[PDB]
Amino acid sequence: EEEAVRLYIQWLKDGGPSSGRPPPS
Protein backbone atom coordinates (compact mmCIF):
# COMPACT_ATOMS: atom_id res chain seq x y z
CA GLU A 1 0.00 0.00 0.00
CA GLU A 2 0.90 3.66 -0.32
CA GLU A 3 -0.40 7.12 0.15
CA ALA A 4 -1.30 7.79 -3.36
CA VAL A 5 -3.38 4.67 -3.44
CA ARG A 6 -4.67 5.58 -0.02
CA LEU A 7 -5.40 8.95 -1.51
CA TYR A 8 -6.80 7.21 -4.43
CA ILE A 9 -9.02 5.07 -2.41
CA GLN A 10 -9.82 8.41 -0.90
CA TRP A 11 -10.39 9.53 -4.48
CA LEU A 12 -12.63 6.57 -4.72
CA LYS A 13 -14.30 7.58 -1.47
CA ASP A 14 -14.86 10.84 -3.29
CA GLY A 15 -16.58 8.86 -5.99
CA GLY A 16 -13.45 7.80 -7.76
CA PRO A 17 -14.14 8.87 -11.32
CA SER A 18 -17.38 10.35 -10.02
CA SER A 19 -15.23 12.73 -7.97
CA GLY A 20 -14.69 14.76 -11.10
CA ARG A 21 -11.08 14.08 -10.53
CA PRO A 22 -8.83 11.62 -12.31
CA PRO A 23 -7.36 8.80 -10.30
CA PRO A 24 -4.28 9.78 -8.27
CA SER A 25 -2.18 7.05 -9.74
GROMACS .gro file of N, CA and C in nm:
model
   75
    1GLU      N    1   0.084  -0.122   0.000
    1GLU     CA    2   0.000   0.000   0.000
    1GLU      C    3   0.086   0.125   0.000
    2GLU      N    4   0.022   0.239  -0.014
    2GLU     CA    5   0.090   0.366  -0.032
    2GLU      C    6  -0.009   0.477  -0.020
    3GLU      N    7   0.038   0.594   0.017
    3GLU     CA    8  -0.040   0.712   0.015
    3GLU      C    9  -0.124   0.726  -0.107
    4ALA      N   10  -0.061   0.738  -0.218
    4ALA     CA   11  -0.130   0.779  -0.336
    4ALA      C   12  -0.235   0.680  -0.380
    5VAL      N   13  -0.231   0.560  -0.325
    5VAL     CA   14  -0.338   0.467  -0.344
    5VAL      C   15  -0.440   0.490  -0.235
    6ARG      N   16  -0.389   0.513  -0.116
    6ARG     CA   17  -0.467   0.558  -0.002
    6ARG      C   18  -0.554   0.676  -0.041
    7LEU      N   19  -0.485   0.774  -0.097
    7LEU     CA   20  -0.540   0.895  -0.151
    7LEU      C   21  -0.638   0.869  -0.260
    8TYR      N   22  -0.603   0.770  -0.332
    8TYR     CA   23  -0.680   0.721  -0.443
    8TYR      C   24  -0.805   0.653  -0.398
    9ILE      N   25  -0.791   0.566  -0.303
    9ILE     CA   26  -0.902   0.507  -0.241
    9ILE      C   27  -0.985   0.614  -0.173
   10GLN      N   28  -0.918   0.723  -0.139
   10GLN     CA   29  -0.982   0.841  -0.090
   10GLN      C   30  -1.048   0.915  -0.207
   11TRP      N   31  -0.986   0.903  -0.322
   11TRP     CA   32  -1.039   0.953  -0.448
   11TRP      C   33  -1.169   0.881  -0.474
   12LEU      N   34  -1.157   0.751  -0.460
   12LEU     CA   35  -1.263   0.657  -0.472
   12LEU      C   36  -1.374   0.684  -0.372
   13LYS      N   37  -1.335   0.711  -0.249
   13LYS     CA   38  -1.430   0.758  -0.147
   13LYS      C   39  -1.501   0.885  -0.190
   14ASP      N   40  -1.433   0.960  -0.274
   14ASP     CA   41  -1.486   1.084  -0.329
   14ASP      C   42  -1.568   1.054  -0.454
   15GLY      N   43  -1.583   0.926  -0.484
   15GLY     CA   44  -1.658   0.886  -0.599
   15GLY      C   45  -1.572   0.822  -0.706
   16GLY      N   46  -1.444   0.809  -0.677
   16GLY     CA   47  -1.345   0.780  -0.776
   16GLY      C   48  -1.364   0.870  -0.895
   17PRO      N   49  -1.388   0.813  -1.010
   17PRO     CA   50  -1.414   0.887  -1.132
   17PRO      C   51  -1.531   0.984  -1.117
   18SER      N   52  -1.625   0.950  -1.030
   18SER     CA   53  -1.738   1.035  -1.002
   18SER      C   54  -1.698   1.157  -0.919
   19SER      N   55  -1.572   1.160  -0.875
   19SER     CA   56  -1.523   1.273  -0.797
   19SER      C   57  -1.513   1.396  -0.886
   20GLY      N   58  -1.497   1.370  -1.015
   20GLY     CA   59  -1.469   1.476  -1.110
   20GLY      C   60  -1.321   1.484  -1.134
   21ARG      N   61  -1.247   1.415  -1.048
   21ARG     CA   62  -1.108   1.408  -1.053
   21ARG      C   63  -1.065   1.276  -1.114
   22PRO      N   64  -0.953   1.279  -1.182
   22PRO     CA   65  -0.883   1.162  -1.231
   22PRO      C   66  -0.816   1.090  -1.117
   23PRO      N   67  -0.793   0.961  -1.135
   23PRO     CA   68  -0.736   0.880  -1.030
   23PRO      C   69  -0.590   0.918  -1.004
   24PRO      N   70  -0.559   0.935  -0.876
   24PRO     CA   71  -0.428   0.978  -0.827
   24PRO      C   72  -0.323   0.869  -0.831
   25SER      N   73  -0.313   0.810  -0.946
   25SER     CA   74  -0.218   0.705  -0.974
   25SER      C   75  -0.116   0.752  -1.077
   0.00000   0.00000   0.00000
